[PDB]
Design a protein around this ligand. Structure first.
Ligand code: CL
Ligand code: CL
Ligand code: CL
Ligand code: CL
Ligand code: CL
Ligand code: CL
Ligand code: CL
Ligand code: CL
Length: 217
């Protein structure tokens, strides 16, 4: 759904990005990969974070979780110290916890549903202690339901960024009251980015997006 407030998310896979072109293409926001696990740092993060801001894009950072590698508390601190920090400046979104299918091992990272709930709660608690913000959770409905056992525990704690490509509207797990961001394509096109780009829609007005960035709503 390309209507209303639109954005993209990128990582080093997108290479060199011309953010002024992303902005002139009509994008309002972007999430940029910063860290993964305990010691991976996206090589394009600093430049993207700087250039997106200078181009006037409301932007934030995301952490790709590896729950098997360390506690939720540990990865939240790592993220907050390496790109996930937040402060009010009209252009910084609250950080994102990208927790999804394990790319190298059991899909739920060897954690029981109860341990996974604890891990996510710990990441949220530490990220909030570090930044004052409620971390945004990026995941798929399948992963959420399977690995957390259809948990409703984050409904009042974390905005939901749902990944559901190729559908007219996203399916939302019962554990979230609604979706805040929705990644509807991983094969889009946007000026300034060469090749496939992830496209996102924000569930609300331009003012609501700014309020989310500034922590006023
Ligand atoms: Cl289009
Ligand atoms: Cl364009
Ligand atoms: Cl860590
Ligand atoms: Cl694992
Ligand atoms: Cl918040
Ligand atoms: Cl529940
Ligand atoms: Cl909807
Ligand atoms: Cl497109």
């Amino acid at each position: 759904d390309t209507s209303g407030v639109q954005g993209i998310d990128v990582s080093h896979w997108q290479g060199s990005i011309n953010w002024s072109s992303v902005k002139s293409a009509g994008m309002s926001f972007a999430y940029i990969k910063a860290t993964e696990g305990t010691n991976y740092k996206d090589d394009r993060f600093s430049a993207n974070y700087t250039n997106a801001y200078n181009a006037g894009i409301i932007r934030g950072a995301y952490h790709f979780a590896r729950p098997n590698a360390s506690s939720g508390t540990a990865q939240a601190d790592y993220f907050a110290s390496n790109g996930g920090g937040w402060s009010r400046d009209n252009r910084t979104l609250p950080g994102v916890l990208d927790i999804e299918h394990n790319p190298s091992g059991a899909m739920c990272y060897g954690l029981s549903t109860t341990q996974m709930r604890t891990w996510i709660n710990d990441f949220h608690a530490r990220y909030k202690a570090r930044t004052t913000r409620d971390v945004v959770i990026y995941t798929t409905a399948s992963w959420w339901n399977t690995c957390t056992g259809s948990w409703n525990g984050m409904a009042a704690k974390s905005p939901f960024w749902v990944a559901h490509w190729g559908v007219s509207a996203p399916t939302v797990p019962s554990g979230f009251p609604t979706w805040t961001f929705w990644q509807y394509s991983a094969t889009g096109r946007v000026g300034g980015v060469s090749g496939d780009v992830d496209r996102n829609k924000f569930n609300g007005s331009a003012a609501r997006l700014l309020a989310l960035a500034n922590n006023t709503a």
